Structure 1
Amino acid sequence: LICVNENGGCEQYCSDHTGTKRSCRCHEGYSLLADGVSCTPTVEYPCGKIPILEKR
């Protein structure tokens, strides 16, 4: 997979590495799940999320 196509499948940030290798990353306040692509918040108020809508 490559980052320039479809964001490399990553939810957030994407790095290309030497080989057919791709690493996804997450912003501060998020951690990467075992799927290697998804980011889940690790803090109460992660950037770019709207609390009143996240609560619903």
Structure 2
Amino acid sequence: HKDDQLICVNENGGCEQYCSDHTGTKRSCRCHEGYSLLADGVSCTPTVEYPCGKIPILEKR
């Protein structure tokens, strides 16, 4: 549903951020500094107060 997909070129490989292809039917998602990868192997969650690419006044609504 959320995972699956191997080719990073196709739908970003299902990754929220960065994607890397491996030998065979393998794929690894990664997150920018200031973010951590969730157990689903595709989602990224902030680990710092001001992660890049996020707008504070909007994140707090």
For the residue of structure 1 that corresponds to 2:12, the secondary structure is: helix
- Among 21, 43, 47, the alignment partner of 1:16 is 21
State the Cα distance separating 1:6 from its structure 2 match: 0.1
Scaled by the length of structure 2, the TM-score of the pair is 0.91
How far is 1:41 from its partner?
0.1
- How big is each residue's C-alpha offset from its partner over 1:2-45, in whole Å with a ceiling of 9 and x where there is no partner? 10000000000000001100000000000000000000000000
**What is the aligned residue count?**
56
Tell me how far apart the structure 1 counterparts of residues 29 and 21 of structure 2 sit (CA, whole Å). Answer: 9
Deviation at 1:50, TM superposition (A): 0.0
Q: Which runs of 4+ in 1 moved over 6 A?
A: none
Q: Aligned pair 1:55/2:60, yes or no?
A: yes
The percentage of aligned residue pairs carrying the same residue is 100
Relative to the length of structure 1, the TM-score reads 0.99
Gaps of at least 5 residues in structure 2 are: 1-5
